[model samples]
Target: MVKSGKARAHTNIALIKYWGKADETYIIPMNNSLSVTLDRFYTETKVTFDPDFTEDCLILNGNEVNAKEKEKIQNYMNIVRDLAGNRLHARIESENYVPTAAGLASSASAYAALAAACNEALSLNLSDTDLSRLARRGSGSASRSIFGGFAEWEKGHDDLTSYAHGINSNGWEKDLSMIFVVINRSGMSLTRDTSRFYQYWLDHVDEDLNEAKEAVKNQDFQRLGEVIEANGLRMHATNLGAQPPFTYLVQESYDAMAIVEQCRKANLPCYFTMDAGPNVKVLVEKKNKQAVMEQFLKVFDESKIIASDIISSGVEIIK
Candidate 1:
């Protein structure tokens, strides 16, 4: 039986940013955020829903049989079964194309592609929005993986309602792309843990979540930039709030930001966004890509930075 087919999908790092959850079980966010999917980073997987197997299995990067890993995969698979109601068994085999230690958004790409592949394997005809909603159940950021280019994940009240909306055509017509600066090989941090940290910030921070909502409505890049930078700073600040007061930023982190600021001082349209990790993803227009890269190499290790155009295409079957 041709029980399996391959599906490929790319990961994305949030620019406008989404942190904290209004509802934990549903993976609903407290606010909407925007992100651009890069062509250089992604995950590819093949899935087969099997009847012969007694339980769901996941073989990732050629290793398996861990209770923790199996539980994670089963949690997602359970949601898929509930959504599709087909009661199918599945075997998922996935490969992350980026470097193992690189601080790229692997979860976003992995779950997104997993949703697409599993759906194909089950012969469940799901719309882009349906697939996106399914992916969201797996990972909050994975919803954005359903669409390409400049994408936004709307933090809705429930699982069914929360989905990513496509903004631009997922192309270079806007003359934009991302430049990655890998500061620490060790992954920066996981979003799940970060969410708990941000909840504490919301309690003390003066600004209301409504301010974030308004910023999105206006679609003001400058305002968005300010909010995002502040949000990132605040999110990172939480580590200091902890009893241990841990931090992820190294000397290189500050140095990289200083270099980016220099570009800004030079009147370049470049801006920077960061995830829970130390690696920085810089947003630049096509016109400024080369000049920005030249400047970046001066401060950052030349080999650590990678660049890719913004991709617009989302999850699709590729047998």
Candidate 2:
């Protein structure tokens, strides 16, 4: 119960991608997943609770949010209030350094920061696991942002059991690096349908997810990449199988992915994974980081918009 302060949270890339919810009311996921917190993308949030005030206020970046965004923030605040056992209104100001809504998982950092800032504002000393649980209620992926390095979200049966865990941070030993190709960071429009289980993706994840966890444990990048790339593509394939068919990857994404795949064929140790957007994230080591970055520069416009961020540590209270 620190009573108010600033907090920073890092964004994560879902190596194994799936957004389907197991329970809509509690924001539980349809499947378990894993991610790595990246260094370059993060959000800083400050929250204050005024017993004298009447409602919640949300300011993103430098400007105030609209009714729709404000309402969502207010609705999300209700959970924090319920947990704290008080009715004090709050004002939350957050600044995200990532590509806002470009499928870079900015919401993950935003809500994770929200949880910490609110926890401090309300004097609620919640554990990281508790914070993850609270964060899931805001944005399901935010749960994993509670931890850094390697994280796994256990899609448990209910609210209490479903939470994320850190595999490693300071002790996370690997030369892993993530490179991003920003295909749609300009508030690009894409049709994304979120909900209901896609039978194919549901079927594909069981084996690969287990294998991925083992790879992280053994620190085997190649095996891990193989498993994650399979699931990532499987999820996209499931999208095509859905009613009326849709896709998140545009030609740029496909071309970017192709370049990485070609590098792999050329004896480079790089693998590509994409989330809900057309941007592509390539996994590689510093040994050939320049090679991978150079290839992406040749094709994608705004080649300067690439991110070569490494894994990060967990969230922390700042100021």
Candidate 3:
């Protein structure tokens, strides 16, 4: 017998970023994080398990990955197989709608879809929280992608309690949008130096979280924008505290930030956030999207300024 499963999941941009890890093996993060699901970028994956196959296979974006890459995927797959109480070698095919590793959280959508697909193919009736926990094994940011619109991943003490859940934004998220400025398309590794700023952030993160939550609850767009911008800036600042400090900034990144600054100064209610990559994601009111895009177009190409709105639905089985 052959069992096949297919699924799709969207990527999310963290307003309260998740940087450090508490337990690397369990993929537990150092702090609770909040995110907004984007409608534009997503991943679709299919898993097929057949008694005829002897080993697992992986094909990504029409290219079959090499052994080294396949091994990483194999490890993630092993977790799913273990949960299902079966040892089945499968063929996994994935396609990404977001840029591969340009800090777009491609792994978020990739693995979330994989988890859901396997849950289907293996006949494992894992709940959404259970699936979020499983996806956390693949990528921490992915835990938040299990819910749509605004979602938060609570940093529980251990493996069992740490998972994601949806937040009630009172439909406020519909009035907001994100502008992604694609600066790079490939992945870059950071130095392993210790970051002291992480401790500083940990100490002060609660205040920011409270403010962000209140803003969401009250539908205060500017208040939410401030928290998103400040939280992101602090995250990058922490990178500077590391020994032999490193930064993700490039000339284009600075240019994008400058444009955002100019727009904000002129009374546009928009703010920016970034991940480990140089690309910047600007949060703006839906009415201000065209204004922010116009600012970006002054220095950047139209192609790099991708527009997206908040998505209200999360991961789902496509087949």
Candidate 4:
């Protein structure tokens, strides 16, 4: 008998970024962060357990990954194997519509999908919180991807505590949407986070989080956008003061942000957030999404700016 499972998880764009880690080894985040899950981009993964196989096999985006490339996935898969008390080797295949490591937070949904698929394939029957916790071991941001809409991963002190859950489950704005200005390429990727700048980044976190939470609770699009823009700017600021300074900025993103600054001053409710690239995500009222797209079209053509809304389910088993 073959125990196989398939699952899908939506891509997420952070309104509050996860820049550095408190415990890099365990993947514990330095501070609580939140993100918006998008229905447009996702990762679909299928896992099959084969007792006859010699070892775990990984196929990503139609390419079979070599051992040097799969060290992380193997480390993550070990957790699943331990949970289910299985030594059986497995074969895993995954596809991501969003480009990997392009600052689109690909690992968030990829590992979340893998966690869900492994849970089902192994009959682990893990709860969503447990699933989030499990996914967290693979990629920190992935913890939030296990829950749909707005989700928050608390920067818990340790293993038993660090986990994620849905936020404002009932109050989540159904009409809210983010238009991802995605670029299918990778640039400079930050490989490590140290204590060199932790306190600096943490200084305004609590206040920033409180304001963001309140803004979401009240359905105040303008306030939400304002707070997010402020939060993102602060996150980007931390890089400048690092012991050996580094940044995640893509040179052209400044141009995109400049346009957003213009829109904000001109009475538009749109706010922009970015990862490492000029590929920005604009949060706008769903009613005005069309107009927002129309506005961006003037900056970028149709091929680049793909519109999207939030996903209702975090991660789900498809087969």
> Per-residue lDDT tens digits of candidate 4, residues 109-185?
89899999999998889998899989888888888889888888888988768898888746455788887765441
Candidate 3 per-residue lDDT over residues 1-319, each given as its tens digit: 8989999999999998887777878888778889999888999999999878888899999999998988998898888788888888899999999866545669889888888898888888889999999999999878888889999999997889889998988788888899999995211112213776667877877788889988999998889888878988888878777765778788888888888889988999788888887999899989999988998888787878889999988898994
- Give lDDT per model, in order: 0.73, 0.79, 0.85, 0.79
Ten-residue segment with the worst summed lDDT in candidate 4?
A: 185-194
User: By the TM-score metric, which is better: model 2 or model 3?
Assistant: 3
Off by over 4 Å in 3: 101-103, 184-193
Q: How close to the true structure is residue 142 of candidate 4, measured as C-alpha lDDT?
A: 85
**What is the model-wide C-alpha lDDT for candidate 4?**
0.79
Reference-based TM-score of each model: 0.84, 0.92, 0.95, 0.92
Q: Which candidate is the best by lDDT?
A: 3
- The TM-score leader among the candidates is 3
lDDT of 2 by residue, 255-303 (tens): 8878988888887878888887687888887677888887777776654
Residue pairs that clash (backbone atoms under 3 angstroms), model 3: none
| Shift in Å, residue 269, candidate 2 | 1.1
Q: Relative to the unseen true structure, what is the C-alpha lDDT of residue 298 in candidate 2, on a scale of 0 to 100?
A: 72
